[PDB]
């Protein structure tokens, strides 16, 4: 008769990390990769012998910075001359070249110099997400919903579809990341009447606020605001500068010129930062950090909060701006949704909850998984082909 259909997948193709989910048995499963990670770095590395994608690429970045590509989403669908591109290039260790006013990343790969369009790098990340899903499902996957930022234009959306097509995926639809996070909570399933939803998305490197209106399951983007210079990496930087100063006071040594020591410090700082989201203090223990000196210390959540205090407070400026743009008052927002791992920070949650006069925040779906979750819900809806009964 009719052979069972393969499940369709939802992919959050993120700037720093990507996530894949599948809706089955009335629920979403966020799929872990083979290293047990529920999110996969959006990284691709090139060597003389291999092309590594995800954790394998990110884990070898220290010694191969010129041939490990990340942040391709910041280049996707943009012109080489775009001022965003020109500024971002100064921070990247890999080469970005100009091919007819279109940026390409240029690397050493399998004995040759090779250049790739941003959509080709993103297709490599999408190929890894498809394989992660296929390892769990136990069969080939064809259909996917891929998400993008609400501010992406036509060129950026088409280049994302192109990345999916290069990866061998049939792209069912390109949907906005804030819309997918709202779908994850079933905010489009509450019946008739308008609901105003604010999505608070704090990433590794950028912060996005979106205001959506949902009426009878129909989404309208009312306002977008944010800060391109606010993310998790800025909190890691504050901890790095703090501990560099601490080592100077305690051992009368400046470690800041040994890249390995700084990198080991930053890696430890990011993990201590994550621990501080669940505990009121966290230890930092690095053996032979610099000149054979063991660095065994601690940091309280209160000190970390003081170190990043201005940065956390600045998340409320784009919230106020988005509300003015949407012509809405804070009391008129029905739902608050958290997106991004950095939203697990208790102080970030408290500042936003206090701003909205004590309101509950939707954070029950892991914030680094909500976008893929919503994309998986939509992918299952889009492949339905029910024929009406008489
Ligand atoms: N529990 C957590 N508490 C604080 N921060 C976190 C947590 N989990 C994640 Br994930 N992050 C940060 O989210 C960003 C994602 O690119 C990175 O800056 C991560 O450090
Ligand atoms: Mg995201």
Curated annotation (Swiss-Prot):
Subcellular location field: Cytoplasm; Nucleus; Cytoplasm, Cytoskeleton, Microtubule organizing center, Centrosome; Secreted
Effect annotated for changing residue 201 to A: Reduces affinity for ADP
Effect of residue 12 to A: Reduces affinity for ADP
Keywords of the record: Acetylation, ATP-binding, Chaperone, Cytoplasm, Cytoskeleton, Host cell receptor for virus entry, Host-virus interaction, Methylation, Nucleotide-binding, Nucleus, Phosphoprotein, Receptor, Secreted, Stress response
Nucleotide-binding domain (NBD): annotated segments: 4-382
Modified sites of kind N-acetylalanine: 4
One of the GO BP terms on file: negative regulation of endoplasmic reticulum stress-induced intrinsic apoptotic signaling pathway
Inducing stimuli: By heat shock.
Variant or mutagenesis effect after changing residue 79 to R: Significant loss of acetylation and ATPase activity. Decreased binding to HOPX and HSP90 and increased binding to STUB1 and NAA10
GO MF entries: ATP binding; ATP hydrolysis activity; ATP-dependent protein disaggregase activity; ATP-dependent protein folding chaperone; C3HC4-type RING finger domain binding; cadherin binding; death receptor agonist activity; denatured protein binding
Note on domains (UniProt): The N-terminal nucleotide binding domain (NBD) (also known as the ATPase domain) is responsible for binding and hydrolyzing ATP. The C-terminal substrate-binding domain (SBD) (also known as peptide-binding domain) binds to the client/substrate proteins. The two domains are allosterically coupled so that, when ATP is bound to the NBD, the SBD binds relatively weakly to clients. When ADP is bound in the NBD, a conformational change enhances the affinity of the SBD for client proteins.
Function statement: Molecular chaperone implicated in a wide variety of cellular processes, including protection of the proteome from stress, folding and transport of newly synthesized polypeptides, activation of proteolysis of misfolded proteins and the formation and dissociation of protein complexes. Plays a pivotal role in the protein quality control system, ensuring the correct folding of proteins, the re-folding of misfolded proteins and controlling the targeting of proteins for subsequent degradation. This is achieved through cycles of ATP binding, ATP hydrolysis and ADP release, mediated by co-chaperones.
Protein name listed in UniProt: Heat shock 70 kDa protein 1A
């Amino acid at each position: 008769g009719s052979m069972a259909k393969a499940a369709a997948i939802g992919i959050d193709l993120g700037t720093t990390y990507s996530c894949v989910g599948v809706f089955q048995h009335g629920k979403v499963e966020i799929i872990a990769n083979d290293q047990g990670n529920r999110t996969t770095p959006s990284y691709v590395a090139f060597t003389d012998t291999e092309r590594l994608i995800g954790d394998a690429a990110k884990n070898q970045v220290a010694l191969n910075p010129q041939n490990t590509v990340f942040d391709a989403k910041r280049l996707i669908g943009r012109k080489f001359g775009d001022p965003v591109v020109q500024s971002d290039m100064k921070h990247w260790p890999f080469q970005v070249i100009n091919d007819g006013d279109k940026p390409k990343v240029q690397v050493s790969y399998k004995g040759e110099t090779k250049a790739f369009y941003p959509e080709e790098i993103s297709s490599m990340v999408l190929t890894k997400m498809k394989e992660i899903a296929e390892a769990y499902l136990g069969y080939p996957v064809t259909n996917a919903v891929i998400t993008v930022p609400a501010y992406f234009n036509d060129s950026q959306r088409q280049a994302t579809k192109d990345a999916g097509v290069i990866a061998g995926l049939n792209v069912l639809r390109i949907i906005n990341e804030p819309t997918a996070a709202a779908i994850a909570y079933g905010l489009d399933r509450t019946g008739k009447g308008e609901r105003n939803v604010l999505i608070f998305d704090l990433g590794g490197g950028t912060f996005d606020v979106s205001i959506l209106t949902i009426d009878d399951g129909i989404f309208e983007v009312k306002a977008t605001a944010g800060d391109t210079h606010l993310g998790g990496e800025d909190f890691d930087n504050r901890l790095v500068n703090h501990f560099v100063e601490e080592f100077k006071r305690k051992h009368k040594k400046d470690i800041s010129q040994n890249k390995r020591a700084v990198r080991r410090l930053r890696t430890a700082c990011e993990r201590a930062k994550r621990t501080l989201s669940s505990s009121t203090q966290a230890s930092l223990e690095i053996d032979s950090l610099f000149e054979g000196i063991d660095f065994y210390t601690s940091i309280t959540r209160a000190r970390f909060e003081e170190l990043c205090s201005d940065l956390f407070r600045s998340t409320l400026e784009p919230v106020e701006k988005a509300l003015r743009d949407a012509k809405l008052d804070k009391a008129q927002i029905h739902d608050l949704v958290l997106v991004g791992g950095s939203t697990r920070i208790p102080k970030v949650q408290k500042l936003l909850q206090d701003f909205f006069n004590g309101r509950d925040l939707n954070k029950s779906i892991n914030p680094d998984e909500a976008v893929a979750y919503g994309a998986a819900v939509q992918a299952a809806i889009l492949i339905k082909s029910t024929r009406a009964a008489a």
